Design a protein around this nucleic acid. Structure first.
Ligand code: MG
Lengths: 136, 244, 455, 42, 42, 69, 386
RNA sequence: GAAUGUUACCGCAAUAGUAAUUGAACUUAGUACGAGAGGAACAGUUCAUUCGGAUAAUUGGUUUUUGCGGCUGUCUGAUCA
RNA sequence: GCAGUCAAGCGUUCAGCGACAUUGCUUUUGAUUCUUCGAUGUCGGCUCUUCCUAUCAUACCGAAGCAGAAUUCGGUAA
RNA sequence: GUGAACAGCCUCUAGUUGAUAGAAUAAUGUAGAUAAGGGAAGUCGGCAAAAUAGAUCCGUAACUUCGGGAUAAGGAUUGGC
RNA sequence: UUCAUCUAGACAGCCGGACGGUGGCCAUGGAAGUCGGAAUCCGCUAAGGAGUGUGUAACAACUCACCGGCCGAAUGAACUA
């Protein structure tokens, strides 16, 4: 789970390997986030770290405000786009993967989140749920 | 009066709970410490129900309601709705809503008389909310903040908004809601006032991180303590000036 | 950094540091090389060993340098405290010596690596590596005294108080044993000796308290004597500089009883001498041990000294006693009011209203009749928390949500909803007065049957 | 972390076994014995 | 319990010859370097 | 490798000829090497040369050479 | 060379050799410790893997994020018709392991076990145990003498049972015969219970019940000769490497000059005996109980048989055991149900299950209907109907 | 896989190998400890990284079932095929 | 490393040898390091097995100004 | 016939059924393919695969020896009656 | 092997003294033997060292070098093999 995350997180499909680009889902001005590392990722030979819905990752802003360029900041994935097994008994996926930049404490930078927010991420991140207008 | 409380290790009281003037909702996560914390102030005076919404502990943000009724998102299962209804008296209306938005607690900020809604909320949802809650509905944003349900707290005694609210915006919103408003912070400077605490006409619950000045401001604005209907806020002016 | 520099890394003496570095180099790095190996392999091995030793020494020295607060340009109060305690000149000299030793080690390692890159025999490379190690050992040994002194000063600074000068704080001044420690103990929760001997507190003591929802911290000091500051101990200099640097409002304590054998004239002379430090502090005079003197029963000639003290504009006289601690609250309130007024005056250098645009607050009668919960009352509520505790505590007790939820009859409270019946789940069909719709459908079926719809 | 051969964890598990853990298995076996006898009584 | 390796005690006659030569050299070196009563017991 | 080659050529050259860019000769002066040249090897002339003068105004190059001479 | 990189090895060295199982029916290596205080009971049972199905149940687990939620998880359905004891085996503790003293048969072996003693059953004259059965003659002293000998010296008692193959939809007519250890004190009572159970049938309900933790042992799925790439998970070589790419490229080194047993070479995969423990039992369905697939919620008169029957299996008509997860071995394979061998009442096992709904839709294709009635109601009347 | 009278069933085990590893969520906790900053630990719980053994419940991928339906050129006179 | 002092001791017969310590060596105010000067010979990587502790972490302990948190060294530990 | 075409495929006259075969479809290979999410993070190195491919229309830059770049580039359609 | 103490009670074990000039001179907030610097003078003994160590702010108190009282006889120190 790591710092900021509340409670335990059940494993889901990892659809965001390191180096993946996901559209920004917050009004902070960023367009897309380039993932360079995954927080809490496992250590294994030749295995590329991968993120998932609700995971905290460090990503750089490839496009958007110039002030946000050249610096890597933590981010929380709100969409994955890869089917994952929900314990309710249904496989679901989002139209496009997306994430929101956040501080190490999980606080949200943007005042609003655009598009649907995954249920797992909202439950695991109280601030994301508070800043999410649409869940699932 | 105002009482400090915390979730497992989260100061966002409003995320995992929803307190009204006649009923309270809490999450079933972990243990009954949150339930016991609420009981220590409300006891058995009003029902306290352990309930989940869409299988999550964020029922506070997912649901919005008042003394007259409660609203739940479309994602709520029928079992949860039935449990909530059975745990609540018939005097509290319960009905599911169908719209693009799902975060009713973040999309709707309302009290027993006046309600604020997201500007993009559909006409049918607005009409249903008005009919169920018996409250006036207005399209507004708190100083450009579209999430009225998360960045503002409202009650019949008073309301609280995030510190970035402009003075003109505060004046307009106070007149529209017919209640006093004060720009402040909760949980040691947290800007999400609507998620960091819950409040009603006679009880307020906030995170442990809430500093003494913030708790005093909340008490003064929401008129919890006896003989403190913002009257003592005048004395708090010097304290705020010194701290600020 | 500031505010309790407690995280300084412990530094071992020169001998211990050298032993640790040598042991780490011998253990972590390989130690087996043979003459039959190529000269390149031996050269690489010895160069790697020398580089590892140099890197370890450099890392240790860098950690020691970084850990310390960098006394220069930290803060006048903290800088002066460090100067008075650790002899800032010697402290800076020792840290500069450590930095110089680090650079010397770096240069030695680089030069020896360059020399060894041209090694031609196993013995030559071994001798060069031994020479580099010996040079590093001698450099470390030359650091004997500074490391020992720095260990002690690091311990002391880690154990020093951490006061914020920018915050609103109180300060107690007066002769030793006048009651400064007693006042600090009574006003705020703190651990300070209250013995009557000459110098009870040998350093500064800090205690926090809250007034009007504002955080305040009280500072106690050993005190000062009537010396003209030409000759003075570091203990008195600490108090003098704490008064000088800190914006805190200072309170001058006095004892009119036979105790504190510096008479009232001596106390007034000390107050007059320290007056220059009292210009901007908004000082207040506190007469302690009032329980045994009651200055109202004081000679007029002696009260002349109190009047002369009062001649200063911003001073005021307060009465308090250790046994009668009730006056401590009044003194605290007066000091807090003065400090807040001064800060508000220096700072300058709101709610909305409905306006009328019926709605009134609503409280259920049960809440009005509800009784306040008492955690220490044996007859308090059941405490569903305690109910879970008696059933195994958190993570074991299973809460039956059906226990409390309301239903028309408790006789069917522990029932189950089928939720499904061969498709078209029950919840969809759940609706009161099913009999009316069923009867209407039956009437429609009866009409169809006699109409010949089903041939 | 502690392995299976961790003495403290093994002692805690043993104490739990002496707790209601073993009583549950005893009750299960007692219930099974009734059906075993019924298999012949029938 | 997990005993480590033990040094072999085999003669390894190569070492025999090496030590013999070393001792022969050492005796000559000592010889070359050489050139350069308790009373009544109690 | 590049710094080693620089030192090798410096030690193997009786005279060192330093080229400069007329656009920004001062920024390209790289004083670090010149101090070592002056200190350790006084006998090395270390002569400057203003290159790329054809890409700058004539008065600019004239002023540069006047101020650097 | 220290490999410059430390990584875990491929495969488990404790499961070697990776060879085919000795027999289709895996033999139990160990049995639960005999509790002298407890009454006599059967320590295991023999069943046949019928298939798998989906189950949704409200999970009661304090402290978990899924408390009071319906978590969907897989279960295995094993056909387990009542078993009949046809003998008893006595073992005497010797300095060289347990040794079989003698065995007694119950005067009457079923044709199913008679087939087990012959390969060409139809050609055989069927000269069955008749001679030994004649030992039950007027006096029958031999049987009583053997029973007394077992009582005198046997330290543990194991009963001989065989599954009612004829009750199984399996095409084969030969049944499986295996021993099951008897627990409880008074070893004389063990043989007395065995004798009273001679020729009698024991149902699974008298051995296992709902929420009981059991360990399943069976022969794993066989796949024949398999490449080292899948047999051990070896990393594939980049492309078109000489001598192929789906193999371990480096097999040895200068020293030692021999291939180590741990190099994880290619070989037979599957068909190896495996032991799986801590399998939670979710449903114990009676053979004669109609609507076996009906829970307290569904309450629909439907059995657990999937529409069109189980894939590569029949139309289960008798008692069956439902256990969560999966069990090694293919459908139609005999699987032995064994106790946990220890107190496995961890809160995972102590928690009581409550199935909200049982999946009975066709596993043959993308079945969408649970029962034919639902299919007819949805699709309605067809051309052939009228 | 022959050989130990033969076939078959059920077994014991000398011997060889072995394994699981680590982190975090509550409770205990904002309690001991603290002037404040802050922050313990055991027992009971719940998840998670890596590794090992199984199985396709459900989802994805794979198609020579060439199973079904469609499309270009061309041939069987046209259609079907 | 070289150049010196002292001797617990050995001792041309007890003048000479000599252990542990010790002085000179290679900008005192954390300031800088903008030197980084010739390896005549390769090293560095894909799959993968084992072994050593001279132990990075997990496990169990002692000593450290170890109030807590946190950190340093040491003992066993592959 | 299809088709810009002596481009690829089918058929007509004409010429052949010649390449040791039978029974399964284990691992590893020879030749050709498909793939959930990321899209070069693998490798010394985009090594190999893949991607646009014909026709019609809009439109086409730096440079230049003014001849070229050019099918630059960047975009919209293609079936049957 | 070489040196020491010894029924003028050997070593080690238990109890008492361990004084008075005196709290000796410099600094001192506090420095009484035991934070630091020069002295480290003299009386009564069987003995008391301007103090061997623990601890107090300061003494106080405990304790050691020695001596004294109880038992009694070998004991202690440095080296060689
Ligand atoms: Mg005092």
């Amino acid at each position: 789970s790591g710092n900021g995350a509340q409670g335990t997180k059940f494993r889901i499909s990892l659809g965001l390997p390191v180096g993946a680009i996901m559209n920004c889902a917050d009004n902070s001005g960023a367009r897309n986030l380039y993932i360079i590392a995954v927080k809490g990722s496992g250590s294994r030979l030749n295995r590329l770290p991968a993120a998932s819905l609700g995971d905290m990752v460090m990503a750089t802003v490839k496009k958007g405000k110039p002030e946000l360029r050249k610096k890597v900041m933590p981010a929380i994935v709100v969409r994955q786009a890869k089917s994952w097994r929900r314990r309710d008994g249904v496989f679901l996926y989002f139209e496009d993967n997306a994430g929101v930049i956040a501080n190490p404490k999980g606080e949200m930078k943007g005042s609003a989140i655009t598009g649907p927010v995954g249920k797992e991420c909202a439950d695991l991140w109280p601030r994301v749920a508070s800043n999410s207008g649409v869940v699932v | 009066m105002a009482t400090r409380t915390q979730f497992e290790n989260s100061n966002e009281i409003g995320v995992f709970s929803k307190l009204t003037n006649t009923y309270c909702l809490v999450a079933v996560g972990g243990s009954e410490n949150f339930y016991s914390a609420f009981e220590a102030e409300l006891g058995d005076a009003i029902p306290i129900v352990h309930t989940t919404i869409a299988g999550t502990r964020i029922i506070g943000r997912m649901t919005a309601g008042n003394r007259r009724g409660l609203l739940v998102p479309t994602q709520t299962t029928d079992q949860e709705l039935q449990h909530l209804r059975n745990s609540l008296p018939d005097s509290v209306k319960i009905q599911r809503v169908e719209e693009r938005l799902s975060a009713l607690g973040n999309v709707i900020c309302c009290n027993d008389y006046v309600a604020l809604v997201h500007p993009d909320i559909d006409r049918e949802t607005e009409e249903l909310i008005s009919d169920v809650l018996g409250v006036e509905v207005f399209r507004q944003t708190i100083s450009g903040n579209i999430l009225v349900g998360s960045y503002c707290s409202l009650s019949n005694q008073g309301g609280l908004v995030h510190p970035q609210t402009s003075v003109q915006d505060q004046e307009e919103l106070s007149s529209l809601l017919q209640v006093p408003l004060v720009a402040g912070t909760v949980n040691r400077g947290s800007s999400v006032v609507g998620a960091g605490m819950v409040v009603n006409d006679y009880l307020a619950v906030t995170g442990l991180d809430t500093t003494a000045p913030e708790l005093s401001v909340i008490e003064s604005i929401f008129r919890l303590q006896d003989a403190q209907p913002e009257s003592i806020s005048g004395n708090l002016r010097d304290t705020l000036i010194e701290t600020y | 950094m500031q505010l309790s520099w407690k995280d300084i890394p412990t530094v071992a003496p020169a001998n211990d540091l050298l032993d640790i570095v040598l042991n780490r180099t011998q253990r972590k790095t390989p130690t087996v090389i043979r003459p039959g190996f190529k000269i390149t392999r031996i050269r690489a091995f010895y160069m790697r060993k020398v580089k590892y030793t140099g890197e370890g020494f450099v890392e240790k020295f860098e950690d020691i340098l970084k850990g310390f607060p960098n006394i220069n340009d930290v803060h006048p109060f903290h800088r002066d405290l460090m100067d008075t305690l650790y002899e800032k000149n010697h402290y800076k000299i020792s840290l500069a010596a450590i930095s110089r030793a680090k650079s010397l080690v770096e240069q030695v390692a680089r030069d020896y690596v360059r020399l060894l890159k041209f090694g031609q025999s196993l013995f030559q490379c071994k001798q060069l590596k031994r020479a580099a190690l010996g040079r590093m050992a001698t450099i470390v040994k030359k650091l004997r005294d500074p490391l020992a002194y720095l260990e002690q000063v690091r311990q002391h600074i880690g154990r020093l108080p951490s006061i914020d000068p920018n915050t609103r704080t109180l300060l107690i001044c007066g002769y030793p044993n006048v009651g400064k420690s007693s006042f600090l103990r009574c006003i705020t929760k703190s651990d300070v000796d209250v013995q009557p001997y000459a110098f009870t507190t040998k350093s500064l003591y800090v205690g926090h308290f809250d007034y009007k929802y504002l955080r305040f911290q009280a500072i106690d000091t050993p005190g000062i004597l009537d010396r003209p500051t030409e000759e003075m101990n570091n203990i008195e200099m600490q108090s003098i500089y704490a008064i000088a640097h800190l914006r805190s409002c200072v309170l001058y304590f006095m004892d009119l009883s036979e105790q504190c054998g510096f008479t009232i004239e001596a106390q007034v002379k000390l107050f007059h001498s320290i007056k220059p430090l009292f210009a901007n502090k908004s000082v207040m005079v506190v007469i302690n041990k009032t329980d045994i003197i009651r200055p109202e029963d004081l000679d007029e000639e002696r009260a002349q000294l109190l009047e002369s003290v009062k001649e200063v504009p911003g001073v005021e006289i307060m009465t308090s006693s250790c046994q009668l601690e009730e006056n401590v609250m009044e003194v605290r309130n007066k000091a807090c009011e003065k400090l807040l007024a001064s800060r508000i005056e220096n700072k300058l250098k709101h709610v909305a209203q409905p306006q009328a645009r019926k709605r009134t607050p609503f409280i259920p009668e049960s809440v009005k009749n509800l009784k306040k919960y008492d955690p220490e009352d044996p007859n308090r509520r059941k405490l569903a928390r305690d109910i879970e505790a008696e059933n195994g505590g958190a993570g074991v007790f299973n809460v039956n949500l059906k226990d409390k939820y309301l239903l028309e009859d408790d006789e069917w409270k522990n029932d189950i909803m089928p939720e499904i019946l061969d498709g078209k789940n029950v919840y969809d069909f759940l609706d009161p007065e099913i009999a009316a719709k069923l009867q209407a459908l039956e009437e429609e079926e009866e009409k169809l049957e006699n109409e010949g719809f089903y041939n | 972390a502690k392995s299976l051969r961790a003495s403290s964890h093994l002692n805690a598990k043993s104490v739990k076994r002496r707790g209601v853990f073993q009583k549950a298995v005893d009750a299960r076996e007692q219930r099974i014995s009734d059906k075993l006898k019924e298999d012949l009584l029938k | 319990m997990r005993v480590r390796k033990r040094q072999s005690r085999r003669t390894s006659t190569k070492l025999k010859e090496g030590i013999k030569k070393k001792a022969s050299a050492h005796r000559k070196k000592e010889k070359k370097m050489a050139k350069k009563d308790p009373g009544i017991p109690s | 490798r590049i710094w080693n080659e620089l030192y090798k050529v410096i030690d193997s050259s009786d005279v060192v000829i330093h080229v400069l860019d007329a656009r920004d000769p001062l920024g390209t002066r790289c004083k670090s090497v010149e101090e070592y040249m002056k200190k350790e090897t006084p006998h090395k002339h270390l002569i400057y040369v203003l290159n790329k003068c054809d890409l700058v105004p004539t008065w600019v190059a004239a002023a540069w050479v006047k101020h650097l001479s | 060379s220290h490999r410059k990189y430390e990584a875990p090895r491929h495969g488990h060295l404790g499961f070697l050799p990776r060879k085919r199982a000795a027999s289709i029916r895996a033999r139990v290596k160990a049995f639960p410790k005999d509790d002298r205080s407890k009454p006599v009971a059967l320590t295991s049972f023999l069943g046949y893997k019928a298939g798998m199905t989906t189950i949704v149940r409200d999970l009661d687990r304090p402290g978990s994020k899924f408390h009071k939620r319906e978590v969907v998880e897989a279960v295995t359905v094993v056909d387990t018709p009542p078993v009949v004891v046809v003998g008893v085996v006595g073992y005497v503790e010797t300095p060289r392991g347990l040794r079989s003293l003698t065995t007694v048969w119950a005067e009457h072996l079923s044709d199913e076990v008679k087939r087990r003693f012959y390969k060409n059953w139809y050609k055989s004259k069927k000269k069955a145990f008749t001679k030994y059965s004649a030992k039950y003659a007027q006096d029958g002293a031999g049987i009583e003498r053997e029973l007394a000998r077992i009582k005198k010296y046997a330290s543990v008692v194991r009963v001989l049972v065989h599954t009612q193959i004829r009750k199984t939809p399996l095409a084969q007519k030969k049944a499986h015969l295996a021993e099951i250890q008897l627990n409880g004190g008074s070893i004389s009572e063990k043989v007395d219970w065995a004798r009273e159970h001679f020729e009698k049938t024991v149902a699974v309900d008298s051995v296992f019940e709902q929420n009981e933790m059991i360990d399943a042992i069976a022969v794993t799925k066989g796949h024949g000769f398999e490449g080292v790439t899948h047999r051990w998970g070896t990393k594939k070589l980049p492309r078109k490497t000489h001598r192929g790419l789906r193999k371990v490229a480096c097999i040895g080194a200068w020293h030692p000059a021999h291939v180590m047993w741990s190099v994880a070479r290619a070989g037979q995969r599957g068909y190896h005996s495996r032991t799986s423990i801590n399998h939670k039992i979710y449903r114990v369905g009676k053979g004669d109980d109609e609507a076996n697939g009906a829970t307290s919620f569904d309450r629909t008169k439907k059995t657990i048989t999937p529409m069109g029957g189980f894939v590569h299996y029949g139309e289960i008509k008798n008692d069956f055991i439902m256990v969560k997860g999966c069990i090694p071995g293919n459908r139609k394979r005999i699987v032995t149900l064994r106790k946990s061998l220890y107190t496995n009442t961890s809160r995972k096992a102590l928690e009581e299950v409550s199935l909200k709904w049982i999946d009975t839709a066709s596993k043959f294709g993308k079945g969408r209907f649970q029962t034919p009635a639902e299919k007819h109601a949805f699709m309605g009347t067809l051309k052939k109907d009228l």
